[PDB]
Design a protein around this motif. Structure first.
Motif, PDB file in Angstrom:
ATOM      1  N   UNK A  20       8.767   3.512   1.424  1.00  0.00           N
ATOM      2  CA  UNK A  20       7.452   4.081   1.671  1.00  0.00           C
ATOM      3  C   UNK A  20       6.487   3.806   0.537  1.00  0.00           C
ATOM      4  N   UNK A  21       6.991   3.427  -0.628  1.00  0.00           N
ATOM      5  CA  UNK A  21       6.099   3.057  -1.710  1.00  0.00           C
ATOM      6  C   UNK A  21       5.521   1.673  -1.480  1.00  0.00           C
ATOM      7  N   UNK A  22       6.380   0.731  -1.081  1.00  0.00           N
ATOM      8  CA  UNK A  22       5.926  -0.599  -0.687  1.00  0.00           C
ATOM      9  C   UNK A  22       5.010  -0.506   0.524  1.00  0.00           C
ATOM     10  N   UNK A  23       5.319   0.422   1.429  1.00  0.00           N
ATOM     11  CA  UNK A  23       4.440   0.719   2.550  1.00  0.00           C
ATOM     12  C   UNK A  23       3.101   1.262   2.073  1.00  0.00           C
ATOM     13  N   UNK A  24       3.121   2.087   1.027  1.00  0.00           N
ATOM     14  CA  UNK A  24       1.890   2.675   0.515  1.00  0.00           C
ATOM     15  C   UNK A  24       1.009   1.621  -0.134  1.00  0.00           C
ATOM     16  N   UNK A  25       1.622   0.652  -0.813  1.00  0.00           N
ATOM     17  CA  UNK A  25       0.854  -0.488  -1.280  1.00  0.00           C
ATOM     18  C   UNK A  25       0.427  -1.382  -0.132  1.00  0.00           C
ATOM     19  N   UNK A  26       1.184  -1.385   0.962  1.00  0.00           N
ATOM     20  CA  UNK A  26       0.792  -2.070   2.174  1.00  0.00           C
ATOM     21  C   UNK A  26       0.747  -3.576   2.056  1.00  0.00           C
ATOM     22  N   UNK A  27       1.905  -4.217   1.913  1.00  0.00           N
ATOM     23  CA  UNK A  27       1.947  -5.667   1.830  1.00  0.00           C
ATOM     24  C   UNK A  27       2.502  -6.349   3.070  1.00  0.00           C
ATOM     25  N   UNK A  28       3.336  -5.671   3.853  1.00  0.00           N
ATOM     26  CA  UNK A  28       3.845  -6.251   5.080  1.00  0.00           C
ATOM     27  C   UNK A  28       4.859  -7.340   4.817  1.00  0.00           C
ATOM     28  N   UNK A  29       4.485  -8.590   5.074  1.00  0.00           N
ATOM     29  CA  UNK A  29       5.317  -9.700   4.649  1.00  0.00           C
ATOM     30  C   UNK A  29       5.171  -9.903   3.140  1.00  0.00           C
TER      31      UNK A  29
END
Length: 58
Positions: A20-29
């Motif tokens: 959810x942290x990578x989701x929060x930064x929102x990079x997708x691929x």
RNA sequence: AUUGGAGGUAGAGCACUGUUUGGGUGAGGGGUCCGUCUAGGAUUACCAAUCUCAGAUAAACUCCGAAUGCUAAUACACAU
């Protein structure tokens, strides 16, 4: 300091407190460089999550 | 991410409850003889009545005490 955000590892196989942290930064691929928000204490993103992203000064 | 609390977990030492190693500390309880008005003074012996000093010991020990995490507010990031 204005920093863009990269990747070195797929999010598979880590904590959901990484997911959810990578989701929060929102990079997708991978390495869709979110050129954004080099302001501190969401440097806690880039430093708590420091196993994952090259600090790339945008 | 910072601040705020809370929790005694791991660890430790023993501060209490438990167990226990030595050393010191001592009635006494069994070995001379005086000796059953007569009890004894005894000899040393096991614990030496505690306590003292180090040595530990534990899930149902904790004078302590984390790092973690949980929660509150705030901050920033998002989108729920």
């Amino acid at each position: 300091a204005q920093i863009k955000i990269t990747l070195v590892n797929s999010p598979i196989g880590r904590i959901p407190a990484q997911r959810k942290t990578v989701k929060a930064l929102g990079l997708g691929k991978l390495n869709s460089s979110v050129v954004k928000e080099g302001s501190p204490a969401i440097l806690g993103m880039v430093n708590s999550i420091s196993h994952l992203v090259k600090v790339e000064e945008a």
